[PDB]
Symmetry: D2
Subunit: 398 residues, 4 copies
C-alpha cells in the first residue's frame, strides 16, 4: 500500500501525505466496473483554488485534484475496453454512463445516486460525492469503460503530454464555453478571464475558426501569454467602458459571443478591479454581447458561498443586469462541462498538430508532488502558470 | 378621413380618438415596400398593460396595439406578393428582412436603423421606434412582402379568426417559449403565468406533444380555463413549495422545461402572492427545472423600470438564484419571439384542426374600439378574457 | 432449464421448440453486466418477415424476435439500476453504452466488437451478432443498466401494455423516421407504408403536431385502420401520379417531409403495384418531397439481397432518382433507429394519455407462442394486424 | 453603350460580344429592388464547364457567370442599404428574401415565381430563370438589399480581393459541404474532388478545425496545390481501394465526414479513372464514411443529362450503393449551397487573417474578358488554375 496525496486540512492548508492504496470499492461495496490508475500527470485548477481559499467546502482530509492522466494498473471484472498499461485521460465529471442524463450525452449532470446521492452531478476532488481527487500517485476511477479516454499510442501521446494533460478538464471546458456560445468560423468573441480555463477558451475559439478573439483580465502577465500568441487583450483596470475598448480592437462595440471563464470570485472593472464582486464578469458579458448573441458560462457559480462579499451572494443570489440581457434576446448556457462530449475530438486536434498555439498560451510548469502546496500558493497570487504535477517523474525533465 | 385609434395619454388614461389617416411614409421618408391595412381584428396584450400601468414608457400620443390581423387596402410600388383585399397576419416584430439578423431568421432583433435608430429591435405600439400601433381602424406596415403572413384561403381563415388572431403575437410567443426550452413529445413542462400568453404556451406544449403540462398562477379564474381543458394547474397562493406541488402532480419535484410567461411585474408565491417581485417567476423556474433542463422566457424584462419595487429593479438588475441554476447546467433563452419563424406552421396546425383546445383555453371576448379602454381596465384587474377588438364589425362571431 | 422459442429453420419454415435456458454468457465468457428476462410480450415485425421470406440471412437454428418487453428474473454482479421483478422495455439495438458511438447517443451503430465483431451495429434476432431473439419464454439482455428501460409502476404499465409493447422498436422507429425528416407542429407529411411501422410513423407525426399526415399503401385494409382514425390515405394501385393524389388532399402537390416505412421489398405504383421494385418507395419520396424538404428512412435497405428482382439490387445497388432529389436540396437520414434516444419520451406520452389514436391505428392481436408461425404466415399475406406474442399468458385474455 | 459579355452559342462555342446595357428590368417588369453592378472580378466555375461541355442546357445567347464581385453603379427606388460606389459580393443564388424558403434562411431554393416560374431555385448564368450571368462588364442584381453582401471597408477588402472573389460561390459552397457533413474541430474528413470547389472545401475544413483532411482526385497537378499546403492527398489513379489508402494516412479505413465536390461528370477509380461514371464519387463516399457519419454533396447532380454515359443517367437515375450507406445510418445533404448563410462569417475569417492557406491552395489566375474562352478551354483540359476575369482591370494584383 501507500498513496502520496494532496490532502485538504483547511483554508490555505494543504498537506502532502501517504494514505492507504486505493481499492476497487466505494461506500464499502466492490466496484467491478472500476480501475486503479497510476497517475502520469495531474494539474492544479482554479476550481481547486476555490477549495484552497475556503470558498468551496470539502471535508477535512479530502484528496484534491480532478485533472487526471494515468495508466491502468488494476481493473475489476467488468472492464472490457481498457487494458493494464493503457494510457488514458480521465474526465473530471464522475459519470455512470447508465442513467438518463448519461444516456442523452449529458455526463456533466449524472443522476446516478451511487455517484452522488445528494445532487445530480459528479466530480473528483470536490466531494461530489466522496470521490478522492487525483493529485496523488494513484487514483480510483469508477465506470472505467464509459469514463476513460484511451490514448491509443503511448509514444505519440507522451510527446504531447503537456497539451494532453488539459484533455481531462480545462480545454474541453473552455471549448465547451465557446461551443455553447455559438463560436464558429468568423465569429467575434469576448472571453472574460485569462486564467488557465480562459486561455484554453481562447485556444478553442481559434481552433473553431473565430475571426476576432478578445480576452479581458485585470492580470497583465496572464494576458501577455495570449497577446504574444496573436490574441487581442483588454486590461480591465482601464476606466474606459469595455464596449469602447472592444470598439477600438474590433470596429464594433459588441461581440457575437461571450464566454465567462471567471466564476463567483470575480472582480470589478476599472477602479473596481481590486474589489471582489460576484456579478463582475456576468454583467460585463450582458453588456458587450450583441442582440441575437449567445453566452457560455464555464466559470463556476455556487448555490452556497461560505464567505461571500454580500449576504445574497451567500445563497448564490446575484445582482444581474437581466433586463438588458433579455432585450437583446441573448441565449445562456451554464454548468459543468460534459468533457466526454469533446475530449476525443480535441485529442484528435492536438495529435494532428492543429493547436501549436496551445502550449504557447498555457505556460505549463511541471512540478513534483511535494512542490504542490507551493504551486497552489503561487497560483493563489496570480501566477501566469498552469501547474502540472508529475508524481512518478514520468515526464522526463523539461 | 381620420383614423380612429387607441391613444396613450398617461398612466391608465387611454383615449379612442381620430388620428390623420396612415400614409406610406415614416420619418417623412417614402416607403415603397409598405402597405396600409384595414384592421379586421386587433387584440389587447399583457405588454399593452405594462404601458397602461405606466411601467413601459411610450410618448404621449402614441397609438397602441401590436396584435394585428388585417386586409390590404393600399400598397407601395415594391409589394409583389400582396394584393389589395388580401387577408394577412402581422408579426408584432417590425423587421426589414434585409439586415444580417433578419437574413439569419432573427427578425425579433432587426438591426436596420430605419426600423429603430437605437436598439436592435422593432415592434408596433411600443415606440420601437415610432411605429404606430394597430389598435385602430387602419395601420401602416412596412416591408410587407417580408413581414406579412397571407392566409391563402380567405374564407377558411375567417371561420377560424378567433384562433388566427393569435398568430400575430401570443401563440408564436408562447410556442417560442416552449420550443426554446426544448419542449417536445413526452416532455414534462412547467409554465409560470396563466394570462393569454401562458395559456398559448400551454396550448403550444400540447401541440408539441408534451406528456405533462403544468401551469401556475395566483389567479384562479385564469387557471380554470386550463383546468377545464385537461391541463394541470397549481394555485400559487398555496403555502407549500412549488417543487412539492409539482411532485404531487408529476411524481417528481422537477420538470424538463420551464417557461416564464409573466415578466417584470411578477408576484411572489404563497404568502407573498399579493406582493410584486420582479424575480418571482425567474427564481421559481431556477428551482423547479431539473439538471440538464432548459428555460424559455417569453415574459418581458426591461433594462429600465420607471416605477420599480426596489432600486436595483429600476435599472433592470434582478436578484437571481443563478448559483442554483448554474449547478444544474440549465440553458436559458430570452427576448421578443421571432414570430415569422413560427407563424406559418402554427397557422397550418390551426387550419387542419390540430388545436381544438385553443379556443377553449383562450376565452376570446370580442369588443369594439369604443370598448377598448374598458377592456384594458377589466384586464388590468385580472380578467380571464383575451380581448380582441373588432374595429369594423368584421368578426360578428360570438 | 427449458426455453420455448421461435426458431428459424428455413424459408417460411419456423418451428416452436424448447432450447436450453439462457445463461449469463456470450461466446463462452461470463457477462456480469447482463440480465435474463422472463418475456411478458414479444411482437412480430416486418424485419422478421424479411428473414421469414428468406431475404435476410440468419443461421439455421437462430431464435427470432427483437420487440421484447419482460421482467428481470436474473442479473449479473454489475447490474446496479435493475432489480429482480422490474418490468422493462428492451430496445432492439444491442448496444454497449461504452464505445464512441454509444457515448455520443448513437446506439443504433454500436462499435463494440463484443456486440458485433464484423460490423458497427447490434440487434436481437438478426444474428447481429449472435444475440438470440426474444420470441421466446426467456431472453438474455447484455449491458442491462444502459440498455433497459424501466416501467416504474408495473400496474400502470400493464394496463397500457398493448401500447408499450411497441416501445421496444416500432414506435421509436416510426417516430425517428418523422423526427429525422423534420416533422414538427404544422408540418405536411407523406409516409410510404401502412404496415405496423408506417402506422406508428403516422401516430408519431400526430403526436409531433403535424398538420396534414398522408399515408400511401397498395394494401387497402391496412390503410383503413389509418383513415378510420382521421388520417389521410392514398391507394397506390391508382394510376394517377402520386403528386396529383397529394394535391387533391392537401392543396399542394408536395409535402415538407417524407418517411420511408417500406424497405427493399418495395412495390411499384399504379399498374406496377404488384411488381416488386426496390426503388419503389424511395423514388416516390424524391418526387413528392418539396424543395428544402427532408426524408427519413426507417425502412430497411440491405447491402446484400440473396434473392433480388435484379442483379444490382443483389449488391444493394439501387436505381435512384438522385438528380431530381439533389436539385431540391433534400436532406436524407438512414439506418436503424436509436431506440434509446426516444423510448423514455414516447413512454411518457403513452402513460400521460397523449396517444389515444395509437391502439386504434395499430390493430394489435395477442397470440400464443405456438400460434406464432400462423401469425407470421398471416402477416406474410398482408394482414392488417400487429401480432404480439404472450408466451406466459401474462396479458389476461383480451 | 453595349455590355461586353461571355455568351453561349453552343458546345465549346463561347463568344465575347456586346449585349444591350442592363436595365433595372426583368420580363419587361420594372425592378424597384434591383441594382446594376460594374463587375470588379468574375470567376469561371466547374458549373460553367458543365454548360461549356453541353452537359447543362441554357438557351443560345445566354450570358454566363455566377461568381460576381462588383460595385454599385445604379439602384432602383427600393434599395436602402446599398449606395452607389459600394463594393459588394453577389451570392450565386437568385433569391427574393420574401418567400417562405428565403424567410427560413433557405435562399438556395427560392420559391418566388418572379425569380423562376417553374422549379424552386434561382441562379445567375444557368437560365434559372432568365437571369443573365456576370461574366461581363455589367450585371443586373435583383432584391439587392437582401442579396448583396457589402464589404464595409472597401480598401481592406480590395487588398484581399483574390480571396474575397470566392465569397460569391465556391468558398461558401465547399464550406457548406463540410458544415452539412458535420465537419467540426477534430473531424476526420474525406473530400472527393480537387477542383476549385474541392480546394475550398479543404480550406473550409481547416478553418473548421478538422484534425485530418484528405482530398482525392485523378488529377495530380490539382492535388499538389493541396499537398504543398499540408493537406493529405490520394491519387485516385492508384489501383488500391480508397478505404485502404485512407487507412495508410489516418490509421482507420473510414472517415467521419464525406464531401462530394465532383458532380455528375464524375470519373471512376484506379483502372476506371479515365472512364466517366456519374456514380463514381457518390459510391466512394458511401464506402469510406463510417457508421454514424455524414455526407455533404456540393457537387451538382441533374434531373436531366443531354449526353449521359448510360440511359438511366439521362434522367438523373443513378446506380447507388444505398444498402451499404443505409446500414451505416449515414446522413446526407444535397443541393445548391445557400451562400447568404455563410458569406458574412467567411468574409470575417478572411479579413482577420484566419485563412492564409486559401490563396496557397486556390491558384488564382487573373485574365481579361477576351481571354475568357481560352480560360474555359484550359480549365476543360484539367487546369489547376482558378480563373478570375477582371473586366475593367480593377485587380492589377498578380
Ligand atoms: N465548468 C467547468 O467544466 C469547470 C471546470 C474547470 C474550471 N472551472 C472554473 O473556471 C474558472 C476559471 O479558473 P482558472 O483555472 O482559469 O483560474 P482563475 O480562477 O485564476 O481565472 C480567473 C481569472 O479571471 C480574472 N478575472 C477576475 N474578474 C474578472 C472579470 N470581471 N472579467 C474578466 N476577468 C476577470 C482573474 O484575474 C483570473 O485571472 C473557475 O471559476 C473554475 O472554477 C469550471
Ligand atoms: N416575448 C414576447 O414575444 C412577448 C410578446 C407578448 C407578450 N409578452 C409578455 O408576456 C407576459 C405575459 O403576457 P400576458 O398577456 O399573459 O399578460 P398578463 O400580465 O395578464 O399575464 C401574467 C400572469 O402571470 C401571473 N403571475 C404573476 N406572478 C407570477 C408568478 N410568480 N408565477 C406564475 N404566474 C405569475 C399573473 O397573475 C398573470 O395572470 C407579459 O409580461 C408580456 O409583456 C412577451
Ligand atoms: N430502422 C429500424 O429501426 C427498423 C426497425 C423495425 C422495422 N424496420 C423496417 O420497417 C419496414 C416496415 O415494416 P412493417 O413492420 O411496417 O411491415 P411491412 O413490411 O409489411 O410494411 C410495408 C408496407 O408498405 C407497403 N408498400 C410496398 N411498397 C410501397 C410503396 N412503394 N409505397 C408505399 N407503401 C408500399 C406494403 O404494402 C406494406 O404494407 C420493414 O422494412 C422493416 O424491416 C426498420
Ligand atoms: N452546390 C453548389 O452551391 C455548387 C456551386 C458551385 C459548383 N458546384 C459544383 O461543384 C463541382 C466541382 O466544381 P469545380 O469548380 O471544382 O469543377 P471541376 O469539374 O473542375 O472539379 C471536379 C474535380 O473532381 C475530379 N474527379 C472526377 N471524378 C472524381 C472522383 N470520382 N473522386 C474524386 N474526384 C473526382 C476531377 O478530376 C476534377 O478535378 C461541379 O460539379 C460544380 O458544378 C456546385
Ligand atoms: Zn478544473
Ligand atoms: Zn449517470
Ligand atoms: Zn404582445
Ligand atoms: Zn432587419
Ligand atoms: Zn422491428
Ligand atoms: Zn457501443
Ligand atoms: Zn459555381
Ligand atoms: Zn425567395
Amino acid at each position: 500500500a501507500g498513496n502520496k496525496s494532496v490532502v485538504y486540512h483547511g483554508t490555505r492548508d494543504l498537506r502532502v501525505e501517504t494514505v492507504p492504496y486505493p481499492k476497487l470499492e466505494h461506500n464499502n461495496r466492490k466496484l467491478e466496473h472500476a480501475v486503479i490508475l497510476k497517475v502520469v500527470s495531474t494539474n492544479i485548477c482554479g476550481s481547486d483554488q476555490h477549495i484552497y481559499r475556503g470558498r468551496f467546502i470539502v471535508p477535512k482530509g479530502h484528496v484534491l485534484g480532478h485533472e487526471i492522466t494515468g495508466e491502468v494498473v488494476e481493473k475489476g471484472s467488468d472492464v472490457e475496453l481498457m487494458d493494464i498499461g493503457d494510457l488514458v485521460s480521465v474526465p473530471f465529471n464522475v459519470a455512470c454512463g447508465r442513467c438518463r442524463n448519461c444516456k442523452e450525452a449529458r455526463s456533466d449532470v449524472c443522476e446516478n445516486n451511487l455517484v452522488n446521492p445528494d445532487a445530480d452531478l459528479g466530480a473528483f476532488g470536490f466531494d461530489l460525492k466522496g470521490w478522492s481527487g487525483g493529485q496523488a500517485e494513484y487514483v480510483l476511477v469508477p465506470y472505467a469503460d464509459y469514463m476513460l479516454l484511451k490514448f491509443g499510442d503511448k509514444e505519440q501521446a507522451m510527446e504531447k503530454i503537456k497539451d494532453l494533460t488539459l484533455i481531462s478538464d480545462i480545454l474541453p471546458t473552455g471549448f465547451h464555453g465557446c461551443v455553447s456560445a455559438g463560436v464558429k468560423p468568423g465569429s467575434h468573441v469576448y472571453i472574460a478571464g485569462a486564467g488557465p480555463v480562459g486561455r484554453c477558451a481562447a485556444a478553442g475559439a481559434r481552433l473553431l475558426g473565430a475571426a476576432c478573439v478578445i480576452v479581458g483580465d485585470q492580470n497583465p502577465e496572464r494576458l501577455k501569454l495570449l497577446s504574444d500568441a496573436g490574441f487581442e487583450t483588454i486590461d480591465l483596470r482601464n476606466s474606459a467602458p469595455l464596449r469602447d475598448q472592444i470598439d477600438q480592437i474590433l470596429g464594433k462595440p459588441e461581440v457575437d459571443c461571450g464566454v465567462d471563464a471567471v466564476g463567483f470570485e470575480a472582480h470589478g472593472l476599472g477602479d473596481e478591479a481590486n474589489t471582489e464582486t460576484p456579478n463582475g464578469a456576468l454583467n460585463s458579458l450582458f453588456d458587450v454581447v450583441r442582440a441575437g448573441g449567445a453566452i457560455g458560462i464555464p466559470g463556476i457559480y455556487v448555490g452556497s458561498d461560505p464567505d461571500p462579499v454580500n449576504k445574497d451572494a451567500g445563497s448564490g443570489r446575484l445582482h444581474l443586469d437581466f433586463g438588458k440581457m433579455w432585450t437583446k434576446s441573448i441565449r445562456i448556457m451554464t454548468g459543468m462541462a460534459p468533457v466526454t462530449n469533446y475530449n476525443r475530438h480535441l485529442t484528435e486536434a492536438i495529435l494532428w498538430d492543429q493547436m501549436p498555439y496551445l502550449s504557447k498560451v498555457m505556460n505549463i510548469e511541471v512540478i513534483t508532488l511535494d512542490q504542490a502546496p507551493d504551486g497552489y500558493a503561487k497560483f493563489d497570487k496570480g501566477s501566469p502558470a498552469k501547474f502540472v504535477i508529475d508524481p512518478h517523474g514520468m515526464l522526463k525533465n523539461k
